[model samples]
Target: DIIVDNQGSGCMVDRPFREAIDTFHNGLRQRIAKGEAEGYGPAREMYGLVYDCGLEEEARKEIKLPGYADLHHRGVTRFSGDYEGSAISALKEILETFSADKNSMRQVVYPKATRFGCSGRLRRRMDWVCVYDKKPKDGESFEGGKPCNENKDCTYYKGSTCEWNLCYTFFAA
Candidate 1:
């Protein structure tokens, strides 16, 4: 059992975890933007995410003594494995389980929360933590606005393309 650098290596998760998190979470957001994700619908103003070193640092700090608590209210989701594997399978194993969950999916697919970061450990009791840059505000609509019938119907999110009757843009990251 091993921790991915633990509290060392400049406190950063590997690039694969970062890339996987980005693809997975952003893919979920894209589905919601197109009115395709489960438990969610189309949106008029959805935002794409950027990986943040600062938030990665935050993730590293939290995992030091974590019971998967939302210490910062900054959107945290985690998975703990009693049977830890030295080479962690974080992509489908950890993150997959997180977004598959209804409550956890809210944090994963929170559109306004644009930044993302994660950390993983394998100290014979596997643990993972991912944090977002923002959280949904009170009464904030996860999906809002009427569906655009066509591309020309697009309004907000300038330069967005309307597909599946939803206006969205995969913000360059």
Candidate 2:
């Protein structure tokens, strides 16, 4: 089923698939923005992500390369699997990749990045690449902070509130 949220740039993956990818990317960012994720610290300002066709096209081209795509001002996560039929299967793998791979989420949950997208060829391994507009540089660690004590604790993020020892956002992301 489709789960369209923020309607922005069109995606190569179907609407639901696009929605799924966008869902987790922002959800996870919201997670770590409160320093709740397993390894990440709280983010001072984690912008919500919007589906971006431009990032998807770049990811598509890189997934075709032999290995190690060129570095740019983007965060990229790559995972492969043979997900046949339903797009949910593929979307699940993307979620699993973020859950299992501790390091990759660094970008997936990055605080600064505001846009994201994914492109998958579904080759034997079903190569999938999701990219974000911003990649945190060295010395950056998603910017940590104390858990919000009140709504003001998340002042950097609009309409954010402190609850359950975490900072939660009420944005469309």
> What tens-digit string does per-residue lDDT give for candidate 2 at 1-173?
12223344445677666666766666676666666776665445555565667667777777777333346656788777666667577667757765678677667766656566788775445667887766777667667555456777665466764554344453523
Among these predicted structures, which one has the highest TM-score? 2
Clashes in model 1: which pairs?
none
**Where does the lowest 10-residue lDDT sum fall in candidate 2?**
1-10
Question: How does model 1 fare in lDDT?
Answer: 0.61
lDDT, candidate 1, at 116: 62
Please write out the lDDT profile of model 1 over residues 1-173, one tens digit for every residue.
Answer: 01112123343666666666667776776667667766686554455555666567777777886643365667777766555454446345766666668777777776656566777766746677777767766566776654456666655455555554434443422
User: Which residue pairs of candidate 2 clash?
Assistant: none
Where is model 1 more than 4 Å wrong at Cα?
1-11, 66-73, 82-86, 137-139, 145-173
Prediction 2 global C-alpha lDDT: 0.63
Report clashes for each candidate as comma-separated counts.
0, 0
Provide the TM-score for each candidate, comma-separated: 0.68, 0.68
Question: How far is each candidate from the true structure, as Cα RMSD in Å?
Answer: 7.2, 5.3
